[PDB]
Amino acid sequence: SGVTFQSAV
Amino acid sequence: SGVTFQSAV
Amino acid sequence: SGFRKMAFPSGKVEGCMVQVTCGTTTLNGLWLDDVVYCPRAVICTSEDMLNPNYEDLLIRKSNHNFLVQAGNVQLRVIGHSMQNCVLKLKVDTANPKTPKYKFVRIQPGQTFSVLACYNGSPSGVYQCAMRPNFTIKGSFLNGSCGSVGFNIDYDCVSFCYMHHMELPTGVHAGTDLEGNFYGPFVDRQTAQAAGTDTTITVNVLAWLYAAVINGDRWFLNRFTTTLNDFNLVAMKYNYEPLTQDHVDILGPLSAQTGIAVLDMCASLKELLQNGMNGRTILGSALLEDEFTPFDVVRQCSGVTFQ
Amino acid sequence: SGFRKMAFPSGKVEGCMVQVTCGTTTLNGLWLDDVVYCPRAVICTSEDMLNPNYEDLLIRKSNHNFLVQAGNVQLRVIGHSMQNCVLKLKVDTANPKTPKYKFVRIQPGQTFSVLACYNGSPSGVYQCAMRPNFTIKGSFLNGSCGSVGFNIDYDCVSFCYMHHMELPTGVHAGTDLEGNFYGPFVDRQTAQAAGTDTTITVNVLAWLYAAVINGDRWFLNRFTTTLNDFNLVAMKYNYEPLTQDHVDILGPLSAQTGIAVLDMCASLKELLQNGMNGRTILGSALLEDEFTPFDVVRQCSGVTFQ
């Protein structure tokens, strides 16, 4: 995959 | 055994 | 992603821990409003513990026999009374850090966080479960007496455990915050031993659901089981019977993953019958029973990794 | 007695957590004195992440583009700057709850506590280790960006980890508190993957010593090994080489238990070669590598159960 940044909307 | 109470001196 | 044994943030409880001393005995207390709660064994010498009569021992004490230290400040005790196996010391100062709180007596199989403390100073935080035999598998040393277990829900601390003693198998026994022991144990130096324990079936099922949410399905199968047939196997492996109420409690996890509860039961039956054969689940080579269905929901994403 | 994965009490860090918002992106920050520290990715839309030039993105922002919320209070940002992959927002108010603190960059194999937080609100506390491949096996969901890892020593908080992202295997990567990633990772949406990991040998040895202190000896043997011969076996099982410095670090545990380090190495070699054959150690069916020698000393009694 890619990566997952874990900010919020 | 018995039991161990766990206060401090 | 990830799944860890996770405790509640302990700050609301850290601000409540104090040290209580009576004579040569020191332990921890819990300071809420103007009352300090601690094990009544603080009034005993080690010789008193062989056959204490606590009403007789306590009538011999006065308020000034109790020293309560909160950080760098002595609190003056202005009343005392005994409630079951806890002592309540009224002090002249209300704790300005008192959180919103309740006292709750929990059922076996429920989990909680423990703030291990020595001489009123918090040392560490860990998660544990009330076992079916009403012990906890904690980590406590001398001086830990008076440390508390708790859950937190929307900034309200529900205290559920106060630590009293260690049994010969190295497991731990204690009371609710109203001083009633969990299990048959007493605060006396006498032969007591943990009864045979069992595995908390509904929690193992919850943790299998956590494994699926986190993207793992290796242990699933195409089978189902009836509740009755599952419990026949559970009894053989020293697992607690699964009730219809437990089935209902697992509803939300079942709905999130699309795995019927009885289908997860067929998976667990297969795991009990065959073992793991070198595989792991959520990083463990044993079936884990110290996460409740609510713990899984609280920690896992609400979106399953499909 | 007992041995648990134990975190540090999290209250000193809870009082520092805030929420930072820039545009449509929200994450956690750490408020110490009059500065808020957060991942610089707060300034990025998800489209910016494909090939961001952060210096270019940040020069386009002003102080008032940053919203910092601490509980029920808005903090006004009065300066900003970028340090590696962290943003430093100077605010008009010093955090009255700032603990004594340091920032530390840790070595692989060291452990720390993580305070998982969402929207500036702490959710849970757990213990983990920096893996040899510079990932951590955490438990983080969307919104967890900005959560910190720390150790506490005599009321001084050493912060060592700020969370940034999740890799495809579900493990986690982030930075020290000066914004330098652990490992080769970058804060960009691009192919990155954890390198092959290894087991932290000195920590497994420490945990075998914890098992002995707590009264268990089943896995011991009458053999010894040379350091060189042990490392030949370690390499075969994907364990890190044990150095003479690691041997020295295990001195205190060796002295408390009377088991020479090289003798514990002979025990571990036998465990690697034969497995556990249905037995457990400290309640685990796998060899545990997330306790350092210092963790064991801090948690275990100083008196061995002989």
Residue numbers in the entry:
A (entry chain C), B (entry chain C): 1 to 9
C (entry chain A), D (entry chain A): 1 to 306
Quote the passages of the study that discuss this structure, keeping the authors' original sentences.
Further, we solved the structures of SARS-CoV-2 Mpro mutant (H41A) in complex with six cleavage substrates from replicase polyproteins. P6 to P3′ (from S3564 to V3572) can also be seen bound in the substrate binding pocket. The most significant movement can be observed for α46–50 and loop in each protomer, which is likely induced by nsp5|6 substrate binding. The substrate binding pocket in the complex structure is slightly expanded compared with that in the apo mutant structure. In the S1 subsite, which is the most selective subsite, Q3569 at P1 position occupies this subpocket. In our structure, the side chain of the glutamine is stabilized by three hydrogen bonds formed by the Oε1 atom of Q3569 and Nε2 atom of H163, the Nε2 atom of Q3569 and carbonyl oxygen of F140, and the Nε2 atom of Q3569 and an ordered water molecule. These three hydrogen bonds impose an absolute requirement for glutamine in the S1 subsite. The main chain carbonyl oxygen of Q3569 occupies the oxyanion hole, which is stabilized by the amide groups of G143 and C145. The S2 subsite is a deep hydrophobic pocket, which is slightly expanded to accommodate the bulky side chain of F3568 at the P2 site compared with the apo mutant structure. Due to the steric hindrance of the benzyl group of F3568 at the P2 site, Q189 moves outward to interact with the main chain at the P4 site.
